[PDB]
Each structure stands twice: as C-alpha cells, then as structure tokens.
Amino acid sequence: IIGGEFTTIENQPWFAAIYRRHRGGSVTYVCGGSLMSPCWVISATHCFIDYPKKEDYIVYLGRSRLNSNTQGEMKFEVENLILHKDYSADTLAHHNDIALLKIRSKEGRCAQPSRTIQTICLPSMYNDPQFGTSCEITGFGKENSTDYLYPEQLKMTVVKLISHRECQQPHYYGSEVTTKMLCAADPQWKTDSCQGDSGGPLVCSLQGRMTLTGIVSWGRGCALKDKPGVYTRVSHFLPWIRSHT
Ligand SMILES: CC(C)C1=NCCc2ccc(NC(=O)c3ccc4cc(C(=N)N)ccc4c3)cc21
C-alpha cells in the first residue's frame, strides 16, 4: 500500500496471506486473498498462472506480520485450485482475473472462525456502489514503487470508486478497461495499491454490510496521476463463483 495507515488483522478478519515454497526451501510471499467461506478463498489468477500446482502455495488466515506468528493464526493448504478457464493478460489489462483456492488444514479441516478469523460477503446481481463511494483495501504490498522489499506489517487505505466512462477516457485507460472492471483512487493521488497487494480485497460498504466488491488486478504504476487501480467486478462472476463451490 502507498501511504495510508498501519493496521492489524483484527481489523481485517477476512484477509488471507498467500505464500509459495521454492525448490530448495525458502518461502516468499505471493499475493493477498479474501475468505469467502471456511473451505474457500477468492483472489486473482495472475498470481498463479505461471505455476499452476496446488502443492506450491500456503495461505494464512490470521497473520499480522510477514515474518511472525501473530497470535491466533492458522496455517492452511490448497485442496483445489480453480482458475478461470479463459485468462489472458495484455500490456496492462488482465482479462478474467479471478480464482478459487479451496483450503484445508493437514488434519483435513477448513477455516474455524474467531475474533481474528471471519469472512466477508458476496455481492448481488446488478448492485455496485455508485461512483464516489469510498472503500478500503488491505495488503502487504510495496510502500514506494522504488522498492524491492515488502513491508513487515500489514497496511490499509481508502480510495474512491470511479465511474466506467471516467476511467475509459483517453488520459486514463481508454478501451483497455471493459465493463467487468472497476476503478478506484485517491482524488489527490497520494495513496493506492501496488505490487504485492495484487489479488487483495476491495471492500466497499454496500447497504450497511461490508462487501467484497473488487479484487486487486492491474494498474499503471502506483499512485500515478489519472492512472487509477483496476479491480475485477466481483458481482458479475456470481454464476461462476457459484457453479464451482
Ligand atoms: C509474479 C509476477 C512477475 C507476475 N507474474 C505473472 C504476470 C504478472 C502480472 C502482474 C503482476 N503484478 C504486478 O507486477 C503488478 C504491478 C502493478 C500493480 C499496480 C496496481 C495499482 N496501480 N493499484 C495494482 C496491482 C499491481 C500488480 C505480476 C505478475
């Protein structure tokens, strides 16, 4: 995240941190996830499109720091990895960038809810907040583009959603942003999402309830003028999310 505030998992009980083991031993961090139900998690496919092996990942439902066992955590494995069957990635625009990582502990169990481990809500057919609506995003991503190290503590920020036609202007994304994408950003461009926060939760507060509206996907740079962050329009994929769970 760029700027923003340092939070803790207790404030984002549905945030899952996805790791990957290497042939050798080392374990580095990959992307962010959202817990939909005990046995499931939803992210983005570009995080896994290069190593489609389920045995390669590790997910955390309760970790505050990147190299620490923040009280109350639980370690998981990926029982099933379902990628959207038509993913493609252009120069910037990432098509059908949504995925499913069915978790399971070594004993064979799913997520066990607590003050720290909870889940967010699925949207409904044709119902996304109207532009201008502020929402939040959580992630261990970069703080400044000019870095090579992810922040040792989880961060969070607020951004405003932008209309479709506004994000489709020439000095923005043009026609590289379809209807199945959302755009959001600080109107002063000081805070934003960046590499590492990919695949994380874009939570808007729709109708009193917190909802997983977007999914960190792509974006030109990080916090650049007239260059919002793009997100997958979660709602649209209801008949998909549904038919595979
Ligand atoms: C693992 C890496 C190299 C990788 N592999 C598959 C293809 C691929 C696509 C995008 C990325 N992610 C990024 O590098 C990447 C870069 C910039 C990003 C910027 C935003 C944003 N502007 N809010 C939001 C998300 C962002 C993600 C990495 C890969």
PDB file of C-alpha atoms and ligand atoms in Angstrom:
ATOM      1  CA  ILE A   1       0.000   0.000   0.000  1.00  0.00           C
ATOM      2  CA  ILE A   2       1.198   3.564  -0.580  1.00  0.00           C
ATOM      3  CA  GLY A   3       0.814   5.904   2.394  1.00  0.00           C
ATOM      4  CA  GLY A   4      -2.305   5.001   4.396  1.00  0.00           C
ATOM      5  CA  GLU A   5      -2.350   3.507   7.913  1.00  0.00           C
ATOM      6  CA  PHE A   6      -0.693   0.508   9.574  1.00  0.00           C
ATOM      7  CA  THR A   7      -3.475  -1.802  10.771  1.00  0.00           C
ATOM      8  CA  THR A   8      -3.684  -5.331  12.215  1.00  0.00           C
ATOM      9  CA  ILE A   9      -5.500  -8.496  11.181  1.00  0.00           C
ATOM     10  CA  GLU A  10      -8.159  -7.974  13.841  1.00  0.00           C
ATOM     11  CA  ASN A  11      -9.403  -5.042  11.708  1.00  0.00           C
ATOM     12  CA  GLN A  12      -9.437  -7.137   8.515  1.00  0.00           C
ATOM     13  CA  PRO A  13     -10.540 -10.602   9.774  1.00  0.00           C
ATOM     14  CA  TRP A  14     -11.039 -11.939   6.213  1.00  0.00           C
ATOM     15  CA  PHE A  15      -7.538 -11.268   4.838  1.00  0.00           C
ATOM     16  CA  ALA A  16      -5.525 -14.298   3.813  1.00  0.00           C
ATOM     17  CA  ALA A  17      -1.801 -14.063   3.069  1.00  0.00           C
ATOM     18  CA  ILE A  18      -0.658 -16.420   0.302  1.00  0.00           C
ATOM     19  CA  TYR A  19       2.926 -17.809   0.290  1.00  0.00           C
ATOM     20  CA  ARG A  20       4.847 -20.156  -2.026  1.00  0.00           C
ATOM     21  CA  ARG A  21       7.642 -22.686  -1.324  1.00  0.00           C
ATOM     22  CA  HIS A  22      10.614 -22.945  -3.654  1.00  0.00           C
ATOM     23  CA  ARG A  23      12.535 -25.993  -4.840  1.00  0.00           C
ATOM     24  CA  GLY A  24      15.161 -25.762  -2.105  1.00  0.00           C
ATOM     25  CA  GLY A  25      13.376 -24.496   0.983  1.00  0.00           C
ATOM     26  CA  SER A  26      12.843 -20.711   1.046  1.00  0.00           C
ATOM     27  CA  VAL A  27       9.317 -19.363   1.279  1.00  0.00           C
ATOM     28  CA  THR A  28       8.500 -15.958  -0.157  1.00  0.00           C
ATOM     29  CA  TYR A  29       5.188 -14.052  -0.217  1.00  0.00           C
ATOM     30  CA  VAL A  30       2.980 -14.119  -3.282  1.00  0.00           C
ATOM     31  CA  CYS A  31      -0.391 -12.343  -3.059  1.00  0.00           C
ATOM     32  CA  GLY A  32      -3.428 -11.442  -0.943  1.00  0.00           C
ATOM     33  CA  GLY A  33      -6.733 -13.245  -0.521  1.00  0.00           C
ATOM     34  CA  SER A  34     -10.229 -12.977   0.857  1.00  0.00           C
ATOM     35  CA  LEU A  35     -12.024 -15.687   2.835  1.00  0.00           C
ATOM     36  CA  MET A  36     -15.462 -16.345   1.314  1.00  0.00           C
ATOM     37  CA  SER A  37     -16.317 -19.384   3.404  1.00  0.00           C
ATOM     38  CA  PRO A  38     -14.414 -21.828   5.678  1.00  0.00           C
ATOM     39  CA  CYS A  39     -13.284 -24.004   2.806  1.00  0.00           C
ATOM     40  CA  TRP A  40     -12.779 -21.265   0.177  1.00  0.00           C
ATOM     41  CA  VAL A  41     -10.765 -18.104  -0.644  1.00  0.00           C
ATOM     42  CA  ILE A  42     -11.015 -15.818  -3.706  1.00  0.00           C
ATOM     43  CA  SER A  43      -8.064 -13.995  -5.343  1.00  0.00           C
ATOM     44  CA  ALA A  44      -6.705 -13.294  -8.840  1.00  0.00           C
ATOM     45  CA  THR A  45      -5.375 -15.770 -11.335  1.00  0.00           C
ATOM     46  CA  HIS A  46      -2.244 -13.822 -12.423  1.00  0.00           C
ATOM     47  CA  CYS A  47      -0.728 -14.766  -9.051  1.00  0.00           C
ATOM     48  CA  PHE A  48      -0.777 -18.445 -10.030  1.00  0.00           C
ATOM     49  CA  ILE A  49      -0.928 -18.554 -13.844  1.00  0.00           C
ATOM     50  CA  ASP A  50       2.792 -19.400 -14.089  1.00  0.00           C
ATOM     51  CA  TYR A  51       2.990 -22.275 -11.579  1.00  0.00           C
ATOM     52  CA  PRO A  52      -0.480 -23.912 -11.660  1.00  0.00           C
ATOM     53  CA  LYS A  53       0.467 -26.509  -8.995  1.00  0.00           C
ATOM     54  CA  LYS A  54      -1.561 -26.661  -5.856  1.00  0.00           C
ATOM     55  CA  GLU A  55       1.379 -28.079  -3.871  1.00  0.00           C
ATOM     56  CA  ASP A  56       3.228 -24.760  -4.263  1.00  0.00           C
ATOM     57  CA  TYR A  57       1.151 -22.469  -2.042  1.00  0.00           C
ATOM     58  CA  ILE A  58       0.429 -21.696   1.594  1.00  0.00           C
ATOM     59  CA  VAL A  59      -2.365 -19.447   2.861  1.00  0.00           C
ATOM     60  CA  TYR A  60      -2.675 -17.671   6.201  1.00  0.00           C
ATOM     61  CA  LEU A  61      -5.885 -16.690   7.939  1.00  0.00           C
ATOM     62  CA  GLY A  62      -4.614 -14.684  10.899  1.00  0.00           C
ATOM     63  CA  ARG A  63      -1.164 -13.278  10.198  1.00  0.00           C
ATOM     64  CA  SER A  64      -0.395  -9.613  11.017  1.00  0.00           C
ATOM     65  CA  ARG A  65       3.348  -9.502  10.299  1.00  0.00           C
ATOM     66  CA  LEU A  66       5.114 -11.083   7.297  1.00  0.00           C
ATOM     67  CA  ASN A  67       7.722 -12.892   9.449  1.00  0.00           C
ATOM     68  CA  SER A  68       5.877 -13.543  12.677  1.00  0.00           C
ATOM     69  CA  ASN A  69       3.261 -15.806  14.229  1.00  0.00           C
ATOM     70  CA  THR A  70       0.725 -13.158  15.162  1.00  0.00           C
ATOM     71  CA  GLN A  71      -1.378 -14.643  17.947  1.00  0.00           C
ATOM     72  CA  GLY A  72      -4.462 -16.527  16.852  1.00  0.00           C
ATOM     73  CA  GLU A  73      -3.222 -17.717  13.444  1.00  0.00           C
ATOM     74  CA  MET A  74      -3.965 -20.912  11.499  1.00  0.00           C
ATOM     75  CA  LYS A  75      -1.914 -22.448   8.642  1.00  0.00           C
ATOM     76  CA  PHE A  76      -3.579 -23.843   5.506  1.00  0.00           C
ATOM     77  CA  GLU A  77      -3.041 -25.815   2.277  1.00  0.00           C
ATOM     78  CA  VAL A  78      -4.703 -25.681  -1.139  1.00  0.00           C
ATOM     79  CA  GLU A  79      -7.032 -28.671  -1.712  1.00  0.00           C
ATOM     80  CA  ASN A  80      -8.168 -27.380  -5.103  1.00  0.00           C
ATOM     81  CA  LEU A  81      -7.012 -24.527  -7.361  1.00  0.00           C
ATOM     82  CA  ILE A  82      -9.658 -23.441  -9.893  1.00  0.00           C
ATOM     83  CA  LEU A  83      -8.510 -20.826 -12.400  1.00  0.00           C
ATOM     84  CA  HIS A  84     -10.969 -19.055 -14.687  1.00  0.00           C
ATOM     85  CA  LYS A  85     -10.708 -21.019 -17.905  1.00  0.00           C
ATOM     86  CA  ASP A  86     -10.110 -18.100 -20.279  1.00  0.00           C
ATOM     87  CA  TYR A  87      -7.475 -15.927 -18.617  1.00  0.00           C
ATOM     88  CA  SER A  88      -5.350 -13.666 -20.801  1.00  0.00           C
ATOM     89  CA  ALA A  89      -3.066 -10.739 -19.944  1.00  0.00           C
ATOM     90  CA  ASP A  90      -2.306  -7.854 -22.303  1.00  0.00           C
ATOM     91  CA  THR A  91       0.150  -4.978 -21.849  1.00  0.00           C
ATOM     92  CA  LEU A  92      -1.816  -3.744 -18.822  1.00  0.00           C
ATOM     93  CA  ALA A  93      -5.366  -5.130 -18.914  1.00  0.00           C
ATOM     94  CA  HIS A  94      -5.779  -8.530 -17.216  1.00  0.00           C
ATOM     95  CA  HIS A  95      -8.802 -10.438 -18.508  1.00  0.00           C
ATOM     96  CA  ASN A  96     -10.869 -12.815 -16.374  1.00  0.00           C
ATOM     97  CA  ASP A  97      -8.513 -12.402 -13.430  1.00  0.00           C
ATOM     98  CA  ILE A  98     -10.350 -14.238 -10.654  1.00  0.00           C
ATOM     99  CA  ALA A  99      -9.566 -17.507  -8.895  1.00  0.00           C
ATOM    100  CA  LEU A 100     -10.540 -20.076  -6.281  1.00  0.00           C
ATOM    101  CA  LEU A 101      -8.192 -21.656  -3.709  1.00  0.00           C
ATOM    102  CA  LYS A 102     -10.114 -24.284  -1.712  1.00  0.00           C
ATOM    103  CA  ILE A 103      -8.211 -24.540   1.600  1.00  0.00           C
ATOM    104  CA  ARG A 104      -7.735 -27.386   4.067  1.00  0.00           C
ATOM    105  CA  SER A 105      -5.524 -27.975   7.131  1.00  0.00           C
ATOM    106  CA  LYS A 106      -3.298 -31.053   7.408  1.00  0.00           C
ATOM    107  CA  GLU A 107      -5.959 -32.706   9.563  1.00  0.00           C
ATOM    108  CA  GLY A 108      -8.400 -32.039   6.733  1.00  0.00           C
ATOM    109  CA  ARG A 109     -10.409 -29.129   8.201  1.00  0.00           C
ATOM    110  CA  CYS A 110     -11.456 -25.707   6.839  1.00  0.00           C
ATOM    111  CA  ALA A 111     -11.415 -22.259   8.459  1.00  0.00           C
ATOM    112  CA  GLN A 112     -12.516 -22.079  12.110  1.00  0.00           C
ATOM    113  CA  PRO A 113     -13.972 -18.574  12.850  1.00  0.00           C
ATOM    114  CA  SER A 114     -12.708 -16.367  15.686  1.00  0.00           C
ATOM    115  CA  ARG A 115     -12.208 -12.720  16.661  1.00  0.00           C
ATOM    116  CA  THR A 116      -9.385 -12.833  14.117  1.00  0.00           C
ATOM    117  CA  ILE A 117     -10.736 -15.256  11.503  1.00  0.00           C
ATOM    118  CA  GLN A 118     -14.007 -14.172   9.814  1.00  0.00           C
ATOM    119  CA  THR A 119     -15.430 -13.794   6.294  1.00  0.00           C
ATOM    120  CA  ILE A 120     -16.849 -11.019   4.052  1.00  0.00           C
ATOM    121  CA  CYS A 121     -19.971 -11.053   1.888  1.00  0.00           C
ATOM    122  CA  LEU A 122     -20.704 -11.827  -1.771  1.00  0.00           C
ATOM    123  CA  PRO A 123     -22.393  -9.044  -3.803  1.00  0.00           C
ATOM    124  CA  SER A 124     -25.720  -9.408  -5.646  1.00  0.00           C
ATOM    125  CA  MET A 125     -26.689  -9.334  -9.344  1.00  0.00           C
ATOM    126  CA  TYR A 126     -26.594  -5.728 -10.587  1.00  0.00           C
ATOM    127  CA  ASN A 127     -25.617  -3.856  -7.418  1.00  0.00           C
ATOM    128  CA  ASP A 128     -22.343  -1.968  -7.050  1.00  0.00           C
ATOM    129  CA  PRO A 129     -21.890   1.306  -5.211  1.00  0.00           C
ATOM    130  CA  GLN A 130     -22.297   4.445  -7.336  1.00  0.00           C
ATOM    131  CA  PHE A 131     -19.087   6.279  -8.181  1.00  0.00           C
ATOM    132  CA  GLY A 132     -17.659   8.479  -5.462  1.00  0.00           C
ATOM    133  CA  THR A 133     -18.273   5.822  -2.805  1.00  0.00           C
ATOM    134  CA  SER A 134     -15.234   5.326  -0.573  1.00  0.00           C
ATOM    135  CA  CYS A 135     -13.966   1.808   0.067  1.00  0.00           C
ATOM    136  CA  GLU A 136     -10.856   0.132   1.584  1.00  0.00           C
ATOM    137  CA  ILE A 137      -8.081  -2.263   0.502  1.00  0.00           C
ATOM    138  CA  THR A 138      -5.669  -4.368   2.592  1.00  0.00           C
ATOM    139  CA  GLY A 139      -2.212  -5.637   1.687  1.00  0.00           C
ATOM    140  CA  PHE A 140       1.465  -6.356   2.357  1.00  0.00           C
ATOM    141  CA  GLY A 141       2.377  -4.737  -0.941  1.00  0.00           C
ATOM    142  CA  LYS A 142       5.033  -2.092  -1.591  1.00  0.00           C
ATOM    143  CA  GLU A 143       5.031   1.331   0.051  1.00  0.00           C
ATOM    144  CA  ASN A 144       7.032   3.008  -2.694  1.00  0.00           C
ATOM    145  CA  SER A 145       7.435   1.865  -6.255  1.00  0.00           C
ATOM    146  CA  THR A 146      11.224   2.280  -5.915  1.00  0.00           C
ATOM    147  CA  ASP A 147      11.483  -0.669  -3.532  1.00  0.00           C
ATOM    148  CA  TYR A 148      12.326  -4.342  -3.586  1.00  0.00           C
ATOM    149  CA  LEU A 149      11.103  -5.232  -0.109  1.00  0.00           C
ATOM    150  CA  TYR A 150       7.565  -5.766   1.105  1.00  0.00           C
ATOM    151  CA  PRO A 151       6.500  -4.014   4.360  1.00  0.00           C
ATOM    152  CA  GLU A 152       6.956  -6.039   7.532  1.00  0.00           C
ATOM    153  CA  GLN A 153       3.471  -5.033   8.833  1.00  0.00           C
ATOM    154  CA  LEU A 154       0.054  -5.052   7.141  1.00  0.00           C
ATOM    155  CA  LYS A 155      -1.214  -1.708   5.803  1.00  0.00           C
ATOM    156  CA  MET A 156      -4.578  -0.284   4.700  1.00  0.00           C
ATOM    157  CA  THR A 157      -6.044   2.700   2.853  1.00  0.00           C
ATOM    158  CA  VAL A 158      -9.254   4.166   1.462  1.00  0.00           C
ATOM    159  CA  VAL A 159      -9.947   5.024  -2.177  1.00  0.00           C
ATOM    160  CA  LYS A 160     -12.991   6.316  -4.087  1.00  0.00           C
ATOM    161  CA  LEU A 161     -14.678   4.338  -6.875  1.00  0.00           C
ATOM    162  CA  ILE A 162     -14.640   5.902 -10.321  1.00  0.00           C
ATOM    163  CA  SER A 163     -17.354   5.597 -12.980  1.00  0.00           C
ATOM    164  CA  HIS A 164     -16.874   3.418 -16.036  1.00  0.00           C
ATOM    165  CA  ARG A 165     -16.927   6.256 -18.550  1.00  0.00           C
ATOM    166  CA  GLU A 166     -14.484   8.298 -16.437  1.00  0.00           C
ATOM    167  CA  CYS A 167     -11.897   5.519 -16.321  1.00  0.00           C
ATOM    168  CA  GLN A 168     -12.463   4.941 -20.060  1.00  0.00           C
ATOM    169  CA  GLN A 169     -11.303   8.460 -21.031  1.00  0.00           C
ATOM    170  CA  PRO A 170      -8.142   8.817 -23.201  1.00  0.00           C
ATOM    171  CA  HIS A 171      -5.825  10.131 -20.451  1.00  0.00           C
ATOM    172  CA  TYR A 172      -6.905   7.146 -18.351  1.00  0.00           C
ATOM    173  CA  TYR A 173      -7.303   3.572 -19.621  1.00  0.00           C
ATOM    174  CA  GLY A 174      -9.175   4.024 -22.891  1.00  0.00           C
ATOM    175  CA  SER A 175     -10.867   0.877 -24.142  1.00  0.00           C
ATOM    176  CA  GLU A 176      -8.480  -1.395 -22.217  1.00  0.00           C
ATOM    177  CA  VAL A 177     -10.979  -1.246 -19.334  1.00  0.00           C
ATOM    178  CA  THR A 178     -14.128  -3.294 -20.093  1.00  0.00           C
ATOM    179  CA  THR A 179     -17.456  -3.363 -18.207  1.00  0.00           C
ATOM    180  CA  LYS A 180     -16.280  -6.196 -15.954  1.00  0.00           C
ATOM    181  CA  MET A 181     -13.706  -3.989 -14.194  1.00  0.00           C
ATOM    182  CA  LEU A 182     -13.835  -1.286 -11.547  1.00  0.00           C
ATOM    183  CA  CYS A 183     -11.579   1.671 -10.950  1.00  0.00           C
ATOM    184  CA  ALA A 184     -10.814   3.432  -7.670  1.00  0.00           C
ATOM    185  CA  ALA A 185      -8.326   6.021  -6.431  1.00  0.00           C
ATOM    186  CA  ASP A 186      -7.335   8.881  -4.144  1.00  0.00           C
ATOM    187  CA  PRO A 187      -8.559  12.090  -5.832  1.00  0.00           C
ATOM    188  CA  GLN A 188      -5.166  13.641  -4.922  1.00  0.00           C
ATOM    189  CA  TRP A 189      -3.188  10.501  -5.926  1.00  0.00           C
ATOM    190  CA  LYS A 190      -1.169  10.058  -2.721  1.00  0.00           C
ATOM    191  CA  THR A 191      -2.431   6.591  -1.717  1.00  0.00           C
ATOM    192  CA  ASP A 192      -3.024   3.432  -3.747  1.00  0.00           C
ATOM    193  CA  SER A 193      -2.426  -0.290  -4.304  1.00  0.00           C
ATOM    194  CA  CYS A 194       0.877  -1.580  -5.702  1.00  0.00           C
ATOM    195  CA  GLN A 195       2.789  -4.809  -6.500  1.00  0.00           C
ATOM    196  CA  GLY A 196       2.245  -7.340  -3.700  1.00  0.00           C
ATOM    197  CA  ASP A 197      -1.259  -6.134  -2.849  1.00  0.00           C
ATOM    198  CA  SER A 198      -2.386  -7.835  -6.062  1.00  0.00           C
ATOM    199  CA  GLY A 199      -5.375 -10.115  -5.643  1.00  0.00           C
ATOM    200  CA  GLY A 200      -6.469  -8.464  -2.385  1.00  0.00           C
ATOM    201  CA  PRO A 201      -9.940  -7.378  -1.121  1.00  0.00           C
ATOM    202  CA  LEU A 202     -11.569  -4.193  -2.382  1.00  0.00           C
ATOM    203  CA  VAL A 203     -14.221  -3.759   0.279  1.00  0.00           C
ATOM    204  CA  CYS A 204     -16.996  -1.202  -0.223  1.00  0.00           C
ATOM    205  CA  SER A 205     -19.743  -0.833   2.393  1.00  0.00           C
ATOM    206  CA  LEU A 206     -22.885  -1.697   0.411  1.00  0.00           C
ATOM    207  CA  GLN A 207     -26.189  -1.377   2.291  1.00  0.00           C
ATOM    208  CA  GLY A 208     -24.907  -1.385   5.843  1.00  0.00           C
ATOM    209  CA  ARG A 209     -22.985  -4.589   5.084  1.00  0.00           C
ATOM    210  CA  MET A 210     -19.293  -4.896   4.223  1.00  0.00           C
ATOM    211  CA  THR A 211     -18.881  -6.475   0.775  1.00  0.00           C
ATOM    212  CA  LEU A 212     -16.093  -7.916  -1.395  1.00  0.00           C
ATOM    213  CA  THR A 213     -16.743  -5.684  -4.402  1.00  0.00           C
ATOM    214  CA  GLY A 214     -13.416  -5.724  -6.165  1.00  0.00           C
ATOM    215  CA  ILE A 215     -10.261  -7.771  -6.469  1.00  0.00           C
ATOM    216  CA  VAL A 216      -6.863  -6.119  -6.945  1.00  0.00           C
ATOM    217  CA  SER A 217      -5.786  -6.904 -10.506  1.00  0.00           C
ATOM    218  CA  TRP A 218      -3.849  -4.299 -12.561  1.00  0.00           C
ATOM    219  CA  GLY A 219      -2.797  -0.661 -12.888  1.00  0.00           C
ATOM    220  CA  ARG A 220      -0.216   1.656 -14.460  1.00  0.00           C
ATOM    221  CA  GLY A 221       2.444   2.198 -11.825  1.00  0.00           C
ATOM    222  CA  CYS A 222       1.412   3.028  -8.281  1.00  0.00           C
ATOM    223  CA  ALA A 223      -0.387   6.220  -7.301  1.00  0.00           C
ATOM    224  CA  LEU A 224       0.237   7.933 -10.621  1.00  0.00           C
ATOM    225  CA  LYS A 225      -1.871  10.813 -11.894  1.00  0.00           C
ATOM    226  CA  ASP A 226      -5.033   9.842 -13.771  1.00  0.00           C
ATOM    227  CA  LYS A 227      -3.951   6.202 -13.536  1.00  0.00           C
ATOM    228  CA  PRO A 228      -6.416   4.505 -11.149  1.00  0.00           C
ATOM    229  CA  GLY A 229      -6.158   0.973  -9.871  1.00  0.00           C
ATOM    230  CA  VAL A 230      -8.308  -1.618 -11.599  1.00  0.00           C
ATOM    231  CA  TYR A 231     -10.334  -4.339  -9.876  1.00  0.00           C
ATOM    232  CA  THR A 232     -12.395  -7.326 -11.015  1.00  0.00           C
ATOM    233  CA  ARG A 233     -16.112  -6.620 -10.831  1.00  0.00           C
ATOM    234  CA  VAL A 234     -16.809  -9.468  -8.433  1.00  0.00           C
ATOM    235  CA  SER A 235     -20.602  -9.312  -8.783  1.00  0.00           C
ATOM    236  CA  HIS A 236     -20.551 -10.162 -12.486  1.00  0.00           C
ATOM    237  CA  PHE A 237     -18.927 -13.514 -11.744  1.00  0.00           C
ATOM    238  CA  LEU A 238     -21.722 -14.770  -9.478  1.00  0.00           C
ATOM    239  CA  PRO A 239     -22.868 -17.566 -11.863  1.00  0.00           C
ATOM    240  CA  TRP A 240     -19.207 -18.736 -11.930  1.00  0.00           C
ATOM    241  CA  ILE A 241     -18.243 -18.329  -8.271  1.00  0.00           C
ATOM    242  CA  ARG A 242     -21.465 -20.222  -7.563  1.00  0.00           C
ATOM    243  CA  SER A 243     -21.197 -23.129 -10.014  1.00  0.00           C
ATOM    244  CA  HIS A 244     -17.745 -24.220  -8.736  1.00  0.00           C
ATOM    245  CA  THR A 245     -18.334 -24.172  -4.958  1.00  0.00           C
TER     246      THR A 245
HETATM  247  C1  LIG B   1       4.883 -12.924 -10.475  1.00  0.00           C
HETATM  248  C2  LIG B   1       4.973 -11.664 -11.353  1.00  0.00           C
HETATM  249  C3  LIG B   1       6.231 -11.384 -12.186  1.00  0.00           C
HETATM  250  C4  LIG B   1       3.837 -11.765 -12.286  1.00  0.00           C
HETATM  251  N1  LIG B   1       3.625 -12.963 -12.886  1.00  0.00           N
HETATM  252  C5  LIG B   1       2.503 -13.186 -13.784  1.00  0.00           C
HETATM  253  C6  LIG B   1       2.099 -11.850 -14.503  1.00  0.00           C
HETATM  254  C7  LIG B   1       2.048 -10.677 -13.567  1.00  0.00           C
HETATM  255  C8  LIG B   1       1.101  -9.663 -13.754  1.00  0.00           C
HETATM  256  C9  LIG B   1       1.047  -8.632 -12.804  1.00  0.00           C
HETATM  257  C10 LIG B   1       1.934  -8.614 -11.718  1.00  0.00           C
HETATM  258  N2  LIG B   1       1.672  -7.748 -10.773  1.00  0.00           N
HETATM  259  C11 LIG B   1       2.329  -6.668 -10.818  1.00  0.00           C
HETATM  260  O1  LIG B   1       3.524  -6.682 -11.100  1.00  0.00           O
HETATM  261  C12 LIG B   1       1.522  -5.508 -10.513  1.00  0.00           C
HETATM  262  C13 LIG B   1       2.104  -4.255 -10.842  1.00  0.00           C
HETATM  263  C14 LIG B   1       1.449  -3.047 -10.502  1.00  0.00           C
HETATM  264  C15 LIG B   1       0.190  -3.058  -9.833  1.00  0.00           C
HETATM  265  C16 LIG B   1      -0.467  -1.832  -9.583  1.00  0.00           C
HETATM  266  C17 LIG B   1      -1.746  -1.754  -9.009  1.00  0.00           C
HETATM  267  C18 LIG B   1      -2.289  -0.391  -8.816  1.00  0.00           C
HETATM  268  N3  LIG B   1      -1.921   0.610  -9.641  1.00  0.00           N
HETATM  269  N4  LIG B   1      -3.152  -0.119  -7.800  1.00  0.00           N
HETATM  270  C19 LIG B   1      -2.419  -2.982  -8.655  1.00  0.00           C
HETATM  271  C20 LIG B   1      -1.766  -4.237  -8.894  1.00  0.00           C
HETATM  272  C21 LIG B   1      -0.455  -4.311  -9.486  1.00  0.00           C
HETATM  273  C22 LIG B   1       0.232  -5.536  -9.834  1.00  0.00           C
HETATM  274  C23 LIG B   1       2.949  -9.558 -11.572  1.00  0.00           C
HETATM  275  C24 LIG B   1       2.963 -10.624 -12.483  1.00  0.00           C
END
